[PDB]
């Protein structure tokens, strides 16, 4: 599919509402494995199971190890832009 920029709005008291898997140590991109009901990703739409996360708020997640990506993603607050692709 196309590379997509997707808006997600996250208050500080809540998570992103996604689970991720994969990462450089496994030879695959950071992939969305789950979208959790009623949380920001679910509410906003636009993100799907199987999407690869290429970047978040301009921060490159390509070639990032699972833990690195967890750290970066978990630091984002407020209006968050995801760059994803379903490939």
């Amino acid at each position: 599919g196309p590379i997509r920029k997707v808006l997600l709005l996250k208050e500080d008291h809540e998570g992103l509402g996604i689970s991720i898997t994969g990462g450089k140590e496994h030879g695959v991109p950071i992939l969305i494995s789950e979208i959790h009901p009623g949380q920001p990703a679910d509410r906003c739409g636009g993100l799907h199971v199987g999407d690869a996360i290429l970047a978040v708020n301009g921060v490159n997640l390509r070639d990032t190890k699972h833990k690195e990506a967890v750290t970066i993603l978990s630091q984002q607050r407020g209006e968050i832009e995801f760059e994803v692709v379903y490939v």
């Binding site: 998570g15 996604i18 991720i20 699972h66």
Partner: peptide, 8 residues
């Protein structure tokens, strides 16, 4: 769930 997963 082939690899480790993290909820965010």
């Amino acid at each position: 769930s082939r690899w480790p997963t993290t909820r965010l």
